[PDB]
């Protein structure tokens, strides 16, 4: 289960919605930020929960999974161009020190965040830093999509 955030324009998303088995073909031609199997680390780092069990009405969960859950055999989420500015502002507003304070490698190991492997507790700082790097890559992707008039698709499958 790899995760990526794709950029889709209006004509293509409407075409997609007018029609997620073989989603990797309809999206095959779209630009994407691919974060391999680190998508749940990212979800956890921003929300304290797994994407497999998010808190109800969690805007930060939606910041990663998308404003709209089109599917959930792998997630497919959508965030309209009209919704990206808010998502971007939400992520840029986060206090990094705050996120770090909340991040616990012990909680991550216990909650069995995907892929479900344990980490030495000595890697807490490094893992967190790695997550912040993915968050920064996502922010840059969203900003590009917003500025170009496109929409975002979170694909996890």
CA nearest neighbour of 91 among 122, 53, 135? 135
Q: Give me the domains of the chain, ranges plus CATH numbers.
A: 1-157 (3.40.1760.10)
Sheet holding 75-79, edge to edge: 32-34, 3-8, 151-156, 75-79, 68-71
CA nearest neighbour of 39 among 131, 144, 152? 131
If you count them, how many residues does the chain have? 157
Place of tokens 């999974």: 65
Q: What is the 3-state secondary structure (H, E, C) of 23-48?
A: HHHHCCCCCEEECCCCHHHHHHHHHC
**Within 13 Å of residue 91, how many CA atoms lie on the same side as its CB?**
27
Give the whole-angstrom CA distance, residue 74 versus residue 157: 4
- 33: buried, middle or exposed (CB in 10 Å: 19+, 13-18, 0-12)? buried
Place of tokens 């009405």: 57
CA nearest neighbour of 137 among 32, 41, 49, 52? 32
Q: In sequence order, what are the residues at sequence separation of 6 or more whose Cβ sits closer than 8 angstroms to the Cβ of residue 150?
A: 7, 8, 9, 10, 81
Give the single-character DSSP code of 65. Answer: H
Resolution (A): 1.6
Give the whole-angstrom CA distance, residue 104 versus residue 110: 10
154 close to 66: Cβ distance less than 8 angstroms: yes
């Amino acid at each position: 289960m790899i995760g990526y955030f794709a950029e889709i324009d209006s004509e293509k998303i409407n075409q997609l919605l007018e029609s997620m088995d073989n989603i990797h073909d309809t999206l095959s031609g779209l630009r994407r930020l691919d974060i391999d199997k680190r998508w749940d680390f990212l979800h956890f780092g921003l929300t304290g929960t797994s994407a497999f069990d998010p808190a109800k009405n969690d805007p930060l969960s939606r910041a990663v999974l998308g404003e709209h859950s089109l599917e959930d055999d792998g997630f497919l989420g959508l965030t309209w161009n009209q919704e990206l500015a808010a998502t971007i502002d939400r992520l840029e507003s986060l206090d990094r020190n705050e996120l770090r304070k909340q991040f616990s490698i012990k909680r991550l190991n216990e909650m069995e965040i995907y892929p479900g492997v344990t980490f030495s507790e000595e890697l807490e700082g490094q893992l967190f830093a790695s997550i912040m790097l993915d968050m920064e890559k996502l922010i840059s992707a969203y900003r590009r999509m917003l500025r170009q008039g496109n929409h975002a698709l979170t694909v996890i499958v």
